[PDB]
Ligand binder design. Structure first.
Ligand SMILES: CCCCC1C(=O)N(c2ccccc2)N(c2ccc(O)cc2)C1=O
Ligand SMILES: CCCCC1C(=O)N(c2ccccc2)N(c2ccc(O)cc2)C1=O
Ligand SMILES: CCCCCCCCCCCCCC(=O)O
Ligand SMILES: CCCCCCCCCCCCCC(=O)O
Ligand SMILES: CCCCCCCCCCCCCC(=O)O
Ligand SMILES: CCCCCCCCCCCCCC(=O)O
Ligand SMILES: CCCCCCCCCCCCCC(=O)O
Ligand SMILES: CCCCCCCCCCCCCC(=O)O
Length: 582
């Protein structure tokens, strides 16, 4: 229309508009106090209404980037508090906007946000719902300036719901805590997947991204034509590129356009899009990106038809290599929603290396003829890992299952820090308790999603404090080889045992008064230290000590003079256990 602010305000709503302006300002001006952003928001909202009333009103015709930049350059302590950023105000649009992007701190030095007691939260919530929620929305946004705003708003409403429901509960904590803990992880995962996808698009490039997308979109819309999935991969690639550059306005607009395009060609893409396409502007996109895989066509040919038996394979492949491979991927991915995207990529890479080393052969058709026989082991590796790991997980519980992983990975990389092994193994354990409850056909896609962030977080840490060449080998490896690389690690034999430290295996009754999570991590840490001291120990040998300690802990927390129990019994355990481990 003739007025940008008016337009956005109208088809967004006052509530959503006020929330996004807030998040937008908090992501740039991360150092300003809450009361300061609230003022900006009201001033901007007041302005918007003016434009809604009279489209021709002053400044209402200016662009959003321009207006946003102007108000930004209004902050008087700009230079004093953000130094260099203030010099941005001297530039002219769009150099000004670019300038702001460049000076956005992806991770400032703000104190960790602590979770207050349920009663204080619920009371603060009841006594002033709006400031309570906007204040936190502010704290979150300033700490994650690259987190897509609309996405951040979706989370806020889920938090609003948890309070509404739980603060009315008889037992508030039993209701709230589990919901908050879940919200946090779900949020952290969302954040990580976001940062992960941008980093990938930078290192590996556009080809790999597009490949990843063709596969992913084909599993979802197995009925859409290949030309549609391509049209879509092209636009999706532009969307992410932009959204990754960090410009919110461009990003949002590109996501909107794509969501409308999809909804309009709905019948030509997937049946599962009805619900999503009815929802309001601010959710259409979110819904869609989350949509379930449509049912795949009933009568579908055999891949070997056009890709192994056809006589024009090399002819069609030289014509346009990536198109052909994309086509291969499309046909392969849409017949396998049960495969992880990365697996589909491995098969395509494998099929690619073949056509390259066969279309240059005397008789092509006979050279590549048995290619599908080479997929088998590639497909089975991940399947067997899942079955084998999910079985074990059902035998033991989440907690005990995490201990098994602890022993397993400490042996593979004893050089890694003890608290890093516990963090990683616990998170790994969670992926098992989340994906194993799924029926086989959805397990692999599930593990991939969760495993990708855990492996990324793991690599980041190590990036900072490098400790093993192998981990760096796996971490800097190709995205498609990453997990198989870690799966291929073997017990470290070069490793030299950690010297026995008395303290490290001493325990006081305080563990008794500690919370479930606290006890576990307390035990799990000793478990890692144990394996680092006796790496050549056997599961049996180990299993014995563990269960001994196990009891010793209970048999002392449910005992009279607890401290002596741990002191006297503890002297014994350590003494015997060492004997058992020679
Ligand atoms: C690398 C992480 C990809 C996340 C993602 C996704 O799955 N869809 C997506 C894209 C096409 C079909 C189905 C889902 N879109 C997306 C959704 C809505 C929109 O309007 C713009 C883009 C995405 O950004
Ligand atoms: C008789 C069936 C044995 C199954 C079993 C197993 O594989 N681990 C096990 C034992 C040692 C190393 C790795 C795994 N432990 C176990 C697991 C967690 C725990 O905290 C205590 C013990 C077991 O009890
Ligand atoms: C989304 C913005 C609203 C957040 C309000 C909930 C407060 C809890 C935040 C503390 C984070 C945590 O759970 O560790
Ligand atoms: C003023 C700044 C508000 C701009 C946000 C527009 C919201 C568009 C939603 C796009 C999407 O579906 O992701
Ligand atoms: C238009 C569709 C583009 C997709 C091209 C297919 C290429 C698949 C190769 C497998 C990807 C491995 C990633 C990589 O090594 O770059
Ligand atoms: C603990 C649960 C382990 C999950 C098995 C890993 C399977 C990885 C699937 C992703 C891939 O294909 O690389
Ligand atoms: C540090 C510990 C390394 C983490 C390795 C976990 C990788 C998961 C792949 C599953 C497997 O095959 O074990
Ligand atoms: C070499 C002497 C040190 C032995 C001390 C045993 C400490 C190991 C703790 C094992 C944790 C048990 C976990 C559980 O509760 O199942």
């Amino acid at each position: 229309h003739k007025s940008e602010v008016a337009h956005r305000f109208k088809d967004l709503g006052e509530e959503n508009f006020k929330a996004l302006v807030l998040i937008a300002f908090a992501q740039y001006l991360q150092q300003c106090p809450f009361e300061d952003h609230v003022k900006l928001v009201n001033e901007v909202t007041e302005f918007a209404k003016t434009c809604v009333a009279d489209e021709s009103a002053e400044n209402c015709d200016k662009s959003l980037h321009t207006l946003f930049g102007d108000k930004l350059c209004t902050v008087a302590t700009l230079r004093e508090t953000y130094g260099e950023m203030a010099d941005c105000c001297a530039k002219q649009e769009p150099e000004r906007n670019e300038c702001f992007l460049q000076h956005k701190d992806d991770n400032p030095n703000l104190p960790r946000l602590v979770r207050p007691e349920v009663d204080v939260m619920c009371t603060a919530f009841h006594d002033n719902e709006e400031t309570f929620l906007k204040k936190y929305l502010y704290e979150i946004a300033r700490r994650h300036p690259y987190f897509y705003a609309p996405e951040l708003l979706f989370f806020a409403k889920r938090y609003k719901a948890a309070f509404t429901e739980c603060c009315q509960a008889a037992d508030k904590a039993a209701c709230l805590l589990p919901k908050l803990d879940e919200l946090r992880d779900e949020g952290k995962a969302s954040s990580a997947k976001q940062r992960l996808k941008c980093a990938s698009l930078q290192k590996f490039g556009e080809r790999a991204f597009k490949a990843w997308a063709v596969a992913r979109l084909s599993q979802r819309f197995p009925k859409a034509e290949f030309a549609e999935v391509s049209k879509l991969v092209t636009d999706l690639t532009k969307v992410h590129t932009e959204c990754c550059h960090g410009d919110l306005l461009e990003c949002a607009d590109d996501r909107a356009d794509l969501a409308k395009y999809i909804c309009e060609n709905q019948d030509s893409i997937s049946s599962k899009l009805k619900e999503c396409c009815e929802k309001p502007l601010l959710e259409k996109s979110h819904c869609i990106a989350e949509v379930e895989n449509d049912e795949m066509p009933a009568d579908l040919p055999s891949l070997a038809a056009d890709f192994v038996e056809s006589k024009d394979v090399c002819k069609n492949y030289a014509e346009a290599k990536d198109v052909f491979l994309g086509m291969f991927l499309y046909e392969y991915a849409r017949r396998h929603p049960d495969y992880s995207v990365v697996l589909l990529l491995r098969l395509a890479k494998t099929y690619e290396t073949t056509l390259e080393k066969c279309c240059a052969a005397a008789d092509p058709h006979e050279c590549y003829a048995k290619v599908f026989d080479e997929f088998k082991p590639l497909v089975e590796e991940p399947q067997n890992l899942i079955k084998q790991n999910c079985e074990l997980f059902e035998q033991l519980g989440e907690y005990k299952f995490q201990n098994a992983l602890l022993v397993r990975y400490t042996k593979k990389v004893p050089q890694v820090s003890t608290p890093t092994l516990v963090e990683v193994s616990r998170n790994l354990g969670k992926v098992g308790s989340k994906c194993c409850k799924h029926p086989e056909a959805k397990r692999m896609p599930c593990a991939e999603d969760y495993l990708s962030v855990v492996l990324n977080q793991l690599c980041v840490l190590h990036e900072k404090t490098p400790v093993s060449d192998r981990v760096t080998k796996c971490c800097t490896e190709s995205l498609v080889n990453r997990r198989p690389c870690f799966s291929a690690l073997e017990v470290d034999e070069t490793y030299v045992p950690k010297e026995f430290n008395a303290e490290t295996f001493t325990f006081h009754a305080d563990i008794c008064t500690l919370s479930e999570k606290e006890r576990q991590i307390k035990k799990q840490t000793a478990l890692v230290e144990l394996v680092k001291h006796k790496p050549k120990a056997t599961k049996e040998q180990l299993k014995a000590v563990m269960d001994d300690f196990a009891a010793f802990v209970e048999k002392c927390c449910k005992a009279d003079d607890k401290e002596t129990c741990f002191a006297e019994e503890g002297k014994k355990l350590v003494a015997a256990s060492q004997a058992a481990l020679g």
